[PDB]
């Protein structure tokens, strides 16, 4: 939507990921590999579960009301009984259309956000030692085995340790 992440700088989704909603695809010293991030998957799901309950009260019992269908033509009171009923339906229909419209709007941007946040979160870990390719994808200027990629997802990636290595690979150009 608005962050330009989903359907934006990320070309497309990954149908081959049933693990979760957001995740990683890393190519490294040990072939390739895919993973999921269950903090970002959970953070979106939590906001979408019970999304409608924060607005619509749980259905309330209604019993004897007025009559809404008539066999006779009575004039004045039947006019009023009808007008009341239609006023209500028109108003609830608009409520229903607008609710759906902006609860959906929100669902789209909430999800799009979580992507951006994940990208940025992992970007801020790498710091000097990487590059944003524009695919929503990183080129790391050093050797990460799978326990290395592990660390970036757990959040325990020490960037100062690889910094020296990173620069020698980065700088060799003129």
């Amino acid at each position: 939507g608005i962050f330009g992440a989903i359907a934006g700088f990320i070309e497309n989704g990954w149908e081959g990921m049933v693990d979760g909603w957001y995740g990683f695809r890393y190519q490294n010293s040990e072939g390739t590999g895919q993973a999921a991030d269950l903090k970002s998957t959970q953070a979106a799901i939590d906001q979408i579960n019970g999304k409608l309950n924060r607005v619509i009260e749980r259905t309330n019992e209604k019993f004897h009301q007025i009559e809404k269908e008539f066999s006779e033509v009575e004039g004045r009171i039947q006019d009023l009984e009808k007008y009341v009923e239609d006023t209500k339906i028109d108003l609830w229909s608009y409520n229903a259309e607008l609710l759906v419209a902006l609860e959906n709007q929100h669902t789209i941007d909430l999800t799009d956000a979580e992507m951006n946040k994940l990208f940025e979160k992992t970007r801020r870990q790498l710091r000097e030692n990487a590059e944003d390719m524009g695919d929503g994808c990183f080129k790391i200027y050093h050797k990460c085995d799978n326990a290395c990629i592990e660390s970036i997802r757990t959040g325990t990636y020490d960037h100062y340790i690889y910094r020296d290595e990173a620069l020698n690979n980065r700088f060799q150009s003129g």
């Binding site: 990954w14 695809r25 019993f63 229903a96 990183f138 200027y141």
Partner: protein, 319 residues
């Protein structure tokens, strides 16, 4: 290598669904949810709510004591169902403000009657007619008592009935309009009748209008029904010099969840918390488009028959 390439992304599905946002009319997302019930169960479900199948009887008939409504004599309900092939089979009558009496009875949630000891000295009781027939013999509304003269005089009736209970009693009674004047005098001596039903707080007097009307079940005369609510501590008083269709007792008027609904849809062993003329409907969805007429824990009626709420992200298959 000396250079890993870590990539981020999100998931997609085989087939997603179009939804509507503020930004777009249509847009694909990974999973939606229908927010509006279109489909009904096909029949009215007898569980959760106590429902009474009115069959051939209307509600007012079932309480007046129509001879084909004797099954309902002792019954109460959460929702009374009036089939539209229903009829009346008794003495032809009308009710000034039928709509209200129906709604009042409907809300009361019962036609449970309570006999009171009325005394009608001077007059002959339990008048009958070829119109209402209990079995093969001439009969009359169960909850009403048709008083005509005894011997050769109809002396003014003046009969009181206190309410020492702590609830409001509801008395149904009526006045009888004969067809001709030869008939007016024959039944009740006086050439002109009257019934003055009164309490401390209110009172009503009705004058019988003599005249031919269309024939229903052989009868040109007719009967008009009226009710009177007698409060706790208050006191009923029926005074009349001809044409009175007297009460036999009273209905307990209840505050309740009870109602009445029109439907020709059948009834079935099945559980549900909504009822409509079309049949019982599912409760889970917040909105609904089956019928505006409803009873029970019912979702809101709207004019749109479909609305999609997204429960997933934007679905972007491979470009």
């Amino acid at each position: 290598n000396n250079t890993a390439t870590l990539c981020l992304g999100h998931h997609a599905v085989a087939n997603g669904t179009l939804v509507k946002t503020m930004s777009d009319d249509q847009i694909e997302v990974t999973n939606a949810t229908e927010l509006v019930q279109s489909i009904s169960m096909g029949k009215i479900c007898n569980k959760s709510y106590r429902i009474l199948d009115g069959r051939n009887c209307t509600l007012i008939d079932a309480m007046l004591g129509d001879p084909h409504c004797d099954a309902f004599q002792y019954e109460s309900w959460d929702l009374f169902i009036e089939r539209s092939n229903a009829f009346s089979n008794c003495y032809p009558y009308d009710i000034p403000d039928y709509a209200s009496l129906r709604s009042i009875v409907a809300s009361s949630g019962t036609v449970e009657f309570t006999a009171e000891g009325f005394t009608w000295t001077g007059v002959t009781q339990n008048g009958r007619s070829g119109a209402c027939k209990r079995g093969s013999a001439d009969s009359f509304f169960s909850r009403l008592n048709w008083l005509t003269k005894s011997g050769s005089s109809y002396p003014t009736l003046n009969v009181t009935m206190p309410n020492n209970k702590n609830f409001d009693k509801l008395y149904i009674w009526g006045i009888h309009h004969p067809s001709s004047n030869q008939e007016q005098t024959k039944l009740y001596i006086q050439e002109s009748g009257r019934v003055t039903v009164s309490t401390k707080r209110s009172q009503q007097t009705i004058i019988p209008n003599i005249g031919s009307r269309p024939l229903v079940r052989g009868q040109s005369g007719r009967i008009s029904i009226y009710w009177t609510i007698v409060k706790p501590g208050d006191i009923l008083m029926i005074n009349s010099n001809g044409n009175l269709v007297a009460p036999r007792g009273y209905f307990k008027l209840n505050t309740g969840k009870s109602s009445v609904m029109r439907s020709d849809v059948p009834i079935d062993i099945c559980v549900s918390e909504c009822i409509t003329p079309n049949g019982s409907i599912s409760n889970d969805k917040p909105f609904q488009n089956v019928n505006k007429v409803t009873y029970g824990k019912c979702p809101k009626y709207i004019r749109q028959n479909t609305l999609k709420l997204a429960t997933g992200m934007r679905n972007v298959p491979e470009k």
